[PDB]
Amino acid sequence: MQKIRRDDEVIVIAGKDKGKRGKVLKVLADDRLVVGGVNLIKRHTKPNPMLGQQGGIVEKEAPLHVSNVAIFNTETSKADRVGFKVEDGKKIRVFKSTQKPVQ
Amino acid sequence: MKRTFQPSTLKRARVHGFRARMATKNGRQVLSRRRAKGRKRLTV
Amino acid sequence: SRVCQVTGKGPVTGNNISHAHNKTRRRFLPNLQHHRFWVESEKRFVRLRVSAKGMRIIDKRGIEAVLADLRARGEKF
Amino acid sequence: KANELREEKSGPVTGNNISHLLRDQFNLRMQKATGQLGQSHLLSQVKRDIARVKTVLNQQ
Amino acid sequence: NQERVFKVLLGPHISEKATGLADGKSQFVFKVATDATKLEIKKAVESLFSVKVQRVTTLNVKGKTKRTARGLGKRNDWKKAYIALQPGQDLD
RNA sequence: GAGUCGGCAAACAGACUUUGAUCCGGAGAUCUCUGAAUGGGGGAACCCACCUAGGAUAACCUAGGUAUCUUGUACUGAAUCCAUAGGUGCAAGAGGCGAACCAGGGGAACUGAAACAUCUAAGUACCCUGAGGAAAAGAAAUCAACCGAGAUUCCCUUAGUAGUGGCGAGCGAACGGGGAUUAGCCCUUAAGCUUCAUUGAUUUUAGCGGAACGCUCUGGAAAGUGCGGCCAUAGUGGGUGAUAGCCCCGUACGCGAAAGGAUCUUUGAAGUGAAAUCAAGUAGGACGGAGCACGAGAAACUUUGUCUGAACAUGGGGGGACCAUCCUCCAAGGCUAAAUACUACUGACUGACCGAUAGUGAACCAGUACCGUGAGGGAAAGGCGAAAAGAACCCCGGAGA
RNA sequence: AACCCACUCCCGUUGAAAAGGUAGGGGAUGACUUGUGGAUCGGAGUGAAAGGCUAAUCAAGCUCGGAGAUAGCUGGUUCUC
RNA sequence: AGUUGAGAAGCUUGCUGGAGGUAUCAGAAGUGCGAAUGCUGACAUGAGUAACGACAAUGGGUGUGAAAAACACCCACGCCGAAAGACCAAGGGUUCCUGCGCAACGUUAAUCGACGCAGGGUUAGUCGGUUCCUAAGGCGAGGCUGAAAAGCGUAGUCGA
Ligand SMILES: [Mg+2]
Ligand SMILES: [Mg+2]
Ligand SMILES: [Mg+2]
Ligand SMILES: [Mg+2]
Ligand SMILES: [Mg+2]
Ligand SMILES: [Mg+2]
Ligand SMILES: [Mg+2]
Ligand SMILES: [Mg+2]
Ligand SMILES: [Mg+2]
Ligand SMILES: [Mg+2]
Ligand SMILES: [Mg+2]
Ligand SMILES: [Mg+2]
Ligand SMILES: [Mg+2]
Ligand SMILES: [Mg+2]
Ligand SMILES: [Mg+2]
Ligand SMILES: [Mg+2]
Ligand SMILES: [Mg+2]
Ligand SMILES: [Mg+2]
Ligand SMILES: [Mg+2]
Ligand SMILES: [Mg+2]
Ligand SMILES: [Mg+2]
Ligand SMILES: [Mg+2]
Ligand SMILES: [Mg+2]
Ligand SMILES: [Mg+2]
Ligand SMILES: [Mg+2]
Ligand SMILES: [Mg+2]
Ligand SMILES: [Mg+2]
Ligand SMILES: [Mg+2]
Ligand SMILES: [Mg+2]
Ligand SMILES: [Mg+2]
Ligand SMILES: [Mg+2]
Ligand SMILES: [Mg+2]
Ligand SMILES: [Mg+2]
Ligand SMILES: [Mg+2]
Ligand SMILES: [Mg+2]
Ligand SMILES: [Mg+2]
Ligand SMILES: [Mg+2]
Ligand SMILES: [Mg+2]
Ligand SMILES: [Mg+2]
Ligand SMILES: [Mg+2]
Ligand SMILES: [Mg+2]
Ligand SMILES: [Mg+2]
Ligand SMILES: [Mg+2]
Ligand SMILES: [Mg+2]
Ligand SMILES: [Mg+2]
Ligand SMILES: [Mg+2]
Ligand SMILES: [Mg+2]
Ligand SMILES: [Mg+2]
Ligand SMILES: [Mg+2]
Ligand SMILES: [Mg+2]
Ligand SMILES: [Mg+2]
Ligand SMILES: [Mg+2]
Ligand SMILES: [Mg+2]
Incomplete structure (x- = not known):
């Protein structure tokens, strides 16, 4: 249905920060993913009006494309493609290297 | 120095209006031709 | 229009050829006059414009027969 | 919901129900004109709830 | 109707000319529905x-x-x- | 099946829910005023109403109805004794719009002829009226020469040939061959076609699963340099920070429907075809015109505006003036699928097609802005980066640029 | 005199103005001038008649089709040997 | 920039550029512009030249402001007064009023504005409409006339 939900933990392939073990926070609609901890950006933002403040340079994460991460396996400890070879009452996300269901 | 256009509204609607064009038979063909080109107005 | 109520004749068109073949258009109208016809069953005159070829058919078929199929094509007499 | 309103709620019972939330629609159009309405989700909610009870009064 | 009373009034119209109007006189400016008569808003004020x-x-x-x-x-x-x-009963 | 509140558009608020929330398909309910617009009028998006029942307080509100014509149908009844016109009440159908296609009604001129009248252009442009998803046409009073062929429609030849033509410009057949397609039924009343009741098949409006890769260099970033391996009914698709069969979506394949939509077919019903009964003001004839390739020409044949007029299968009419002999068909009543023409709209593809002065007038909020009293005319306008990371902070300046 | 009209001179002509201006002129109770609303249209209207006017266009408007009308007539026709 | 061929032209390199290119030999062409009073954008010469829109007329002060011949107030001069003043009908369509501004506009500058952004602002039994009735004129059930479109017109109902 989609290989990557919100509450998953992944690793990064082919980026500025490759091999970084991460964890998905927010999934966008143009299949771009904000991974918590990686791809840091800094924005020169004016301090806010209407009795607010922002101050200066504040970090946040910039999203990256869905083809550049994969579901991490923790039994060979490397990236693995996932699939739906097993379905009996629901399409269960199952690895293809070992045919074992993800959690 | 009378120019050729002296404006009104009661004379404009009775000659060029919708119920003037729709009454005759040539004018109902003026409506379909001007509609099918795709003009926004159809009634000047 | 110039049609008949018995035979169905409308005007046609043709030419008006001269002695050097200068073609020009005209109309062939049919002869048709008003006339009153006595019936017996309704015992009254009926008036309807017919041709001279419609006068010859009324004298042949009869008035009650030609009035019948005039009604049986759905017309006013 | 709609399964509640089918559940043995008659013509007069739901017919009195419309005149209840027309009050709640009126009071949310008076507070919006003045400066006291923060719950903007309530304003677009009773429009989608007068529509339900008008639907079930044509299907029996 | 049982309805149509909860439609013809869309709120007050407080401003500089309506604030001073409701104080020296008793006249309250509403923003009525787009097509309402002078009877069916005389009733929706006496009701509501x-x-x-x-x-x-x-x-x-x-x-x-x-x-x-x-x-x-x-x-x-x-x-x-x-x-x-009336000179009494200033509304809310 | 886990995110969501359409787009230009973008922020900050308020929020909804693990299975039915957005999202996608089937069916329904609501559906303001205009518009054939239809209760009467109007300057289109406005005004004034009646009537019936149901409620509601000197002021109303829900629910319906209320146009003309064409048919049918009960009631009513003028001069007029009867009884027709006429007038009401009800039932059924039509009206309007749409690009091309088809059949009919009406029908030009420029231009060719090195001028121009007959003739061409041309029964073309345009204008009306019809109907259909196709229409029309069709079952021999047809062609052939003493041989024979048997409905129509369409393509390729006969052939630019015989003819026609101020015998000028030009216009132009048939007979016979080759193919596409393959049904003929009735007036003693028929196939067939409609509309429902029917039993199965076929797809159609949403979807689902869907094979196989590692290390190493340079680089901002590897799909690339290297070194190997695997998949295949999937290897020249798209896109991912640069060139990817094996990263992502897809593809070859396999399965898919509560419910509607049709298409073939089931076997019934109601119809209808349908005009009654083998065809009379009909064939032929005489002036005047058209259509036949055929511009009165030895001019046959079909048509109809005016005027006339037969034989009754021992009859009739055809075989290009006309006449005798032979051959071949049954006119004046109807019904018929297929091969065929077209695309405003759909979907899938495909390109020795375009790449923002090209391709639609229009990649951009285009029939818009603007120009006209109007009909009508009608433009110019694409590109930061892989990602907004779209420049905190300081100095000059009007506290700006 | 308002008002309608346009006889003379000069200025203007890339004008302030695609027909004016400043000075002077003619009619000014009538064959008058004018506001609103209507009627007549393209080989056709209107006209105290000049071939004048019919939306700054008139010896027969404007617009869309026939139509890429016809031109023995002008103008142009692109890299090398 | 160099260099090679009779020529059309070819070849190797310095910088800019930041992702596509086409030996060789055959095909298919929307296949090569200086000129058509050619077409559509850009920029010149004229030239910092003519003009800046009636020959009713302006001169000081005080203020604001980054900056006053033109803005506001003050004092004094001028000009229309059968209009250069008031008001209805058309017609226009928010130009009216107040905060905020001055890049563009306004034939110059602008702190000013009929100019930008944000708010505000039109109260009817009697005034004008609608409602009632008609003039010219329009449409016109039925009805006559007409190849078809359609034309004319009675009852009628619109039109100040
Ligand atoms: Mg001729
Ligand atoms: Mg009406
Ligand atoms: Mg009506
Ligand atoms: Mg609007
Ligand atoms: Mg129709
Ligand atoms: Mg000629
Ligand atoms: Mg000619
Ligand atoms: Mg020739
Ligand atoms: Mg000639
Ligand atoms: Mg047929
Ligand atoms: Mg037939
Ligand atoms: Mg024989
Ligand atoms: Mg046969
Ligand atoms: Mg799938
Ligand atoms: Mg796959
Ligand atoms: Mg590719
Ligand atoms: Mg790049
Ligand atoms: Mg690929
Ligand atoms: Mg990889
Ligand atoms: Mg017979
Ligand atoms: Mg004959
Ligand atoms: Mg014969
Ligand atoms: Mg013969
Ligand atoms: Mg012979
Ligand atoms: Mg273009
Ligand atoms: Mg370009
Ligand atoms: Mg005057
Ligand atoms: Mg005078
Ligand atoms: Mg005098
Ligand atoms: Mg003369
Ligand atoms: Mg003129
Ligand atoms: Mg031609
Ligand atoms: Mg030409
Ligand atoms: Mg590429
Ligand atoms: Mg060229
Ligand atoms: Mg050039
Ligand atoms: Mg040259
Ligand atoms: Mg210049
Ligand atoms: Mg000079
Ligand atoms: Mg000088
Ligand atoms: Mg000067
Ligand atoms: Mg001036
Ligand atoms: Mg004075
Ligand atoms: Mg005076
Ligand atoms: Mg404005
Ligand atoms: Mg103002
Ligand atoms: Mg300026
Ligand atoms: Mg302003
Ligand atoms: Mg009022
Ligand atoms: Mg009246
Ligand atoms: Mg009248
Ligand atoms: Mg009539
Ligand atoms: Mg009339």
Whole structure:
């Protein structure tokens, strides 16, 4: 249905920060993913009006494309493609290297 | 120095209006031709 | 229009050829006059414009027969 | 919901129900004109709830 | 109808000319529905505020027209009613 | 099946829910005023109403109805004794719009002829009226020469040939061959076609699963340099920070429907075809015109505006003036699928097609802005980066640029 | 005199104005001038008649089709040997 | 920039550029512009030249402001007064009023504005409409006339 939900933990392939073990926070609609901890950006933002403040340079994460991460396996400890070879009452996300269901 | 256009509204609607064009038979063909080109107005 | 109520004749068109073949258009109208016809069953005159070829058919078929199929094509007499 | 309103709620019972939330629609159009309405989700909610009870009064 | 009373009033119209109007006089400016008569808003004030009103005047407002790029823009026109009450029972 | 509140558009608020929330398909309910617009009028998006029942307080509100014509149908009844016109009440159908296609009604001129009248252009442009998803046409009073062929429609030849033509410009057949397609039924009343009741098949409006890769260099970033391996009914698709069969979506394949939509077919019903009964003001004839390739020409044949007029299968009419002999068909009543023409709209593909002065007038909020009293005319306008990371902070300046 | 009209001179002609201006002129109770609303249209209207006017266009408007009309007539026709 | 061929032209390199290119030999062409009073955008010469829109007329002060011949107030001069003043009908369509501004506009500058952004602002039994009735004129059930479109017109109902 989609290989990557919100509450998953992944690793990064082919980026500025490759091999970084991460964890998905927010999934966008143009299949771009904000991974918590990686791809840091800094924005020169004016301090806010209407009795607010922002101050200066504040970090946040910039999203990256869905083809550049994969579901991490923790039994060979490397990236693995996932699939739906097993379905009996629901399409269960199952690895293809070992045919074992993800959690 | 009378120019050729002296404006009104009661004379404009009775000659060029919708119920003037729709009454005759040539004018109902003026409506379909001007509609099918795709003009926004159809009634000047 | 110039049609008949018995035979169905409308005007046609043709030419008006001269002695050097200068073609020009005209109309062939049919002869048709008003006339009153006595019936017996309704015992009254009926008036309807017919041709001279419609006068010859009324004298042949009869008035009650030609009035019948005039009604049986759905017309006013 | 709609399964509640089918559940043995008659013509007069739901017919009195419309005149209840027309009050709640009126009071949310008076507070919006003045400066006291923060719950903007309530304003677009009773429009989608007068529509339900008008639907079930044509299907029996 | 049982309805149609909860439709003809869309709120007050407090401003500089309506604040001073409700104090020196007793006249309250509402922003009535787009097509309402002088009877069916005489009833919707006696119902929804339990006060007796003597007489009602109305007027129509045209919408102001903006002119930016990609055409013109016509704001929504709307009606307005001055509700002149009794000298007692200033409403809420 | 886990995120969501359409786009230009973008922020800050308020929020909804693990299975039915957005999202996608089937069916329904609501559906303001205009418009054939249809209760009467109007300057289109406005005004004034009646009537019936149901409620509601000197002021109303829900629910319906209320146009003309064409048919049918009960009631009513003028001069007029009867009884027709006429007038009401009800039932059924039509009206309007749409690009091309088809059949009919009406029908030009420029231009060719190195001028121009007959003739061409041309029964073409345009204008009306019809109907259909196709229409029309069709079952021999047809062609052939003493041989024979048997409905129509369409393509390729006969052939630019015989003819026609101020015998000028030009216009132009048939007979016979080759193919596409393959039904003929009735006036003693028929196939067939409609509309429902029917039993199965076929797809159609949403979907689902869907094979196989590692290390190493340079680089901002590897799909690339290297070194190997695997998949295949999937290897020249798209896109991912640069060139990817094996990263992502897809593809070859396999399965898919509560419910509607049709298409073939089931076997019934109601119809209808349908005009009654083998064809009379009909064939032929005489002036005047058209259509036949055929511009009165030895001019046959079909048509109809005016005027006339037969034989009754021992009859009739055809075989290009006309006449005798032979051959071949049954006119004046009807019904018929297929091969065929077209695309405003759909979907899948495909390109020795375009790449923002090209391709639609229009990649951009285009029939818009603007120009006209109107009909009508009608433009110019694409590109930061892989990602907004779209420049905190300081100095000059009007506290700006 | 308002008002309608246009006889003379000069200025203007890229004008303030695609027909004016400043000075002077003619009619000014009538074959008058004018406001609103209607009627007549393209080989056709209107005309105290000049071939004048019919939306700054008139010896027969404007617009869309026939139509890429016809031109023995002008103008142009692109890299090398 | 160099260099090679009779020529059309070819070849190797310095910088800019930041992702596509086409030996060789055959095909298919919307296949090569200086000129058509050619077409559509850009920029010149004229030239910092003519003009800046009636020959009713302006001169000080005080203020604001980054900056006053033109803005506000003050004092004094001028000009229309059968209009250069008031008001209805058309017609226009928010130009009216107040905060905020001055890049563009306004034939110059602008703190000013009929100019930008944000708010505000039109109260009717008697005034004008609608409602009632008609003039010219329009449409016109039935009805006559007409190849078809359609034309004319009675009852009628619109039209100040
Ligand atoms: Mg001729
Ligand atoms: Mg009022
Ligand atoms: Mg609007
Ligand atoms: Mg009507
Ligand atoms: Mg009506
Ligand atoms: Mg029709
Ligand atoms: Mg000629
Ligand atoms: Mg000629
Ligand atoms: Mg020739
Ligand atoms: Mg010639
Ligand atoms: Mg047929
Ligand atoms: Mg037939
Ligand atoms: Mg024989
Ligand atoms: Mg046969
Ligand atoms: Mg799948
Ligand atoms: Mg796959
Ligand atoms: Mg590719
Ligand atoms: Mg790149
Ligand atoms: Mg690929
Ligand atoms: Mg990889
Ligand atoms: Mg027979
Ligand atoms: Mg004959
Ligand atoms: Mg014969
Ligand atoms: Mg013969
Ligand atoms: Mg012979
Ligand atoms: Mg273009
Ligand atoms: Mg370009
Ligand atoms: Mg005057
Ligand atoms: Mg004088
Ligand atoms: Mg005098
Ligand atoms: Mg003369
Ligand atoms: Mg003129
Ligand atoms: Mg031609
Ligand atoms: Mg030409
Ligand atoms: Mg590429
Ligand atoms: Mg060229
Ligand atoms: Mg050039
Ligand atoms: Mg040359
Ligand atoms: Mg210049
Ligand atoms: Mg000079
Ligand atoms: Mg000089
Ligand atoms: Mg000078
Ligand atoms: Mg001046
Ligand atoms: Mg004076
Ligand atoms: Mg005076
Ligand atoms: Mg404005
Ligand atoms: Mg102002
Ligand atoms: Mg300026
Ligand atoms: Mg302003
Ligand atoms: Mg009246
Ligand atoms: Mg009248
Ligand atoms: Mg009539
Ligand atoms: Mg009439």
